[PDB]
Design a protein around this nucleic acid. Structure first.
Lengths: 64, 47, 82
RNA sequence: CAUAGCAUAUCAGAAGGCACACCCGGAGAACUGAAACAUCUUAGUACCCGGAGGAAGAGAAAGAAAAUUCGAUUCCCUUAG
RNA sequence: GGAUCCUGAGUACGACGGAGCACGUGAAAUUCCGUCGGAAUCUGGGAGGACCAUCUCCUAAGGCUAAAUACUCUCUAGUGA
RNA sequence: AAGCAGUAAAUGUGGAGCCGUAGCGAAAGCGAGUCUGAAUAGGGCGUUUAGUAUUUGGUCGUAGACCCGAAACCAGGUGAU
RNA sequence: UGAGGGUAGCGGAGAAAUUCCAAUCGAACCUGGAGAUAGCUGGUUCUCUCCGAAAUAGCUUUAGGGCUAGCCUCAAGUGAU
RNA sequence: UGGGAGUCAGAACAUGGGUGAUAAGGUCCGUGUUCGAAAGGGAAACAGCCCAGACCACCAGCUAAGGUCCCAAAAUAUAUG
RNA sequence: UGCUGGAAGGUUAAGAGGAGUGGUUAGCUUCUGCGAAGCUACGAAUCGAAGCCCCAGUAAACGGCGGCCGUAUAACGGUCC
RNA sequence: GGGAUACUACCCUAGCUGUGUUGGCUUUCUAACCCGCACCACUUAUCGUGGUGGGAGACAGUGUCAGGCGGGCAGUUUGACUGGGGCGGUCGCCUCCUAAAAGGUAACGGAGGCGCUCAAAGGUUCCCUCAGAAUGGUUGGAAAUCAUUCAUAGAGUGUAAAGGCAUAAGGGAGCUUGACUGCGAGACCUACAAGUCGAGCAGGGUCGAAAGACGGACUUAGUGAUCCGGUGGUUCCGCAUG
């Protein structure tokens, strides 16, 4: 029947121009007092999924 | 010795962080640094 | 089994892939690393900076030249004719 | 006294089973998956009960829109995993 | 026209506990359930997914309703890369 | 696509819908730019053609899903010859 | 010791032993869920050619399982790297 | 660049090393080789040793490790001791 | 410890008492708090039943009937509890 | 003096009255309600029924709600590693040796540290430069303190060992607040998660005469996702508009 999606992962990443997947970083959302500044802003970015996890997860995102 | 959070006057956010020592530094320390709201190194104090 | 007594000297670190990364002759970038170290085995010379971890980076792009420094010591040069 | 009860005197309305395939109700779990498990899911499934009709049920505006409302209801496709 | 009159009460609604409604008594506002309480009656009342003001709609608490839909114990007659 | 003429075909009919032809940004928004931003910068993402429909083959997914095989759990019943 | 009866499985009975409850019982038997589940074992159907490994890091309620990487294979591209 | 996979129990040799008892056809790493997945010759038989990689014939030839009195093909061959 | 009994010294609901209040507003001032009589929503000062702390009792109730230096409370001096 | 009689909750020390209508404390009534509570009867059915008298009595009981007890009962869990299992022991990071002159590399293999500290042990500017040994002396336990030469940094360098260090990164004086904002080409490690070093850019400041130099300590450890929850600000959406 119709394929479902990983709703919880819908909420964590965005699709790009070509086909890629634009993700939020992690090690955030709490205490940064134990952290430096370079280490704080360089996490204020967004990265791309690697092809490996992509291989693992491709069937999950049919509808983006 | 705690997570020390200084409150700027009008930079408006709960931004800057450092170390202190209560035994060495029990009172409220203050000093100069760049609050980027204004393009200048201005004073802030513990709060 | 039966009573196998215990021990303690079973603790160590995860190594740090240290040492050099490039060699005498090859050409480089500006943000490029040349040597991860501790202390100063070799001192930066020309167009090189010593970062936090005594990590050496060539300021600029160019070839590398390890060489002695004093009577008995070492340094690094970087030359950008290229 | 009255009507009940009782009496006769009519009528048969009843049960019973049943295609419980479909339908409406009433009651109503586990193994399962989660790589263990309790929330969760399996599922309002399975099984019992009762109604059970030839279909049933629903159905006409205290509605949905900021609409200009198919104009009640029901059904098919999309909206859309 | 509509002034006046009529316009469905333990009802509406609330608290507590529980189910359900994709959505976990929680918003359940919508809708059921009990135990407590508990209303207005147009000049009123309700709804507008926390919510309400304004605005839109409607006027509850009474009833009936073919059509298109579902299944095949059957029956007929027929079909079968 | 549903649906309709047709006949359990076709073909025809049928344009509700779906993909692409501009992207960046959580978003308001902006547009070959856009986001951060402070600029355009710097950088990311872009940009600077070709795709869509049907079908074959291979994989994957949901349904027992290559096959046989438990101990055991649950619901309802039989049984004291 | 007989003929009649009375007790039902989460239960019955029991001078107690996990003992008995139709040749069986640490909770019987028939059906149904149910093709229950099975990281476990076994098995898995005609031919020729060409390439051709691995038994290793790493993380794991994980260790005889699994997911990436490693090393294979095929076809698109670049192309002396 | 993408498509489809299997492998995670490895074994012996020499060799560096640890552990053990300068024990083990032990055990853990490493560096190479062979088996696993590689038949054939030699090692009497002898998965890992020495030689060497089979497309298919042939009653042809040259060689390797090995070896040359009989079984069993090749020198009772030289010359030395 | 369990079991009682008890001083019941206190803390304890469901309950009573109500000093007081958002989201939106036709509302006193029209740069704005008497909260007013109106939807999505509420409080203290106080007490508060079983009981939980406090005390006697309880060993044919559970339980223990010990230990150290002189010494296999197995005799005894010191003894600890 | 010990609180404290102006006023005001208001009073033990009070007395007292009954008031619109009502509830507490307690008794009596009783219908209510109950009575496996005796008598009269339909029924010659002691069921049931009711009348009788008696009892009790608004009590409990029962419904809901809320509590505390509840192996009486039920469903689950009860880690791994491991020269079999088990007991023991350990499980996350940092440093050395094994580790074989790049890096890398195992062992229930060998040795040590960590779960922080310093607003001065930070930043800048300017001075200084080792203990130790003897050298020997009011002290002298020898040597404390002081004294002269050599001392290789051995001294010392906040915290384990390692590298490193007198450019002092060691130690002193003054200033201090760069223990700053927004970025960075790029490079390292690496399965992923990640983690690490960055020229320089604007920016703006501290110190310094300026040059310049400061994006935390000589380095290397000083915990830990994510969801959830919280708090505040908010280029924002937030329901017909508000």
């Amino acid at each position: 029947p119709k394929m479902k999606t990983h709703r919880g992962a819908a909420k964590r990443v965005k699709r790009t121009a070509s086909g890629q997947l634009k993700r939020s970083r992690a090690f955030t959302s709490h205490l940064f007092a134990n952290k430096s500044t370079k280490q704080k802003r360089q996490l204020r970015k967004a990265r791309l999924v690697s092809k490996s996890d992509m291989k693992r997860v491709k069937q999950l995102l049919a509808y983006k | 010795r705690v997570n020390v959070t200084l409150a700027c006057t009008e930079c408006g956010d709960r931004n800057y962080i450092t170390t202190k020592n209560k035994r060495n530094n029990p009172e409220r320390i203050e000093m100069k640094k760049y609050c980027p709201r204004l393009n200048k190194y201005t004073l802030h104090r513990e709060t | 089994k039966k009573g196998v007594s215990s021990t303690k000297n079973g603790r160590d670190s995860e190594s740090k892939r240290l040492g050099a990364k490039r060699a005498d002759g090859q050409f480089v970038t500006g943000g490029s690393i040349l040597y991860r170290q501790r202390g100063t085995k070799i001192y930066p010379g020309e167009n090189v900076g010593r970062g936090g971890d005594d990590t050496l980076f060539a300021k600029i792009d160019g070839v590398v030249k390890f060489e002695r420094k004093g009577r008995d010591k070492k340094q690094v040069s970087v030359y950008a004719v290229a």
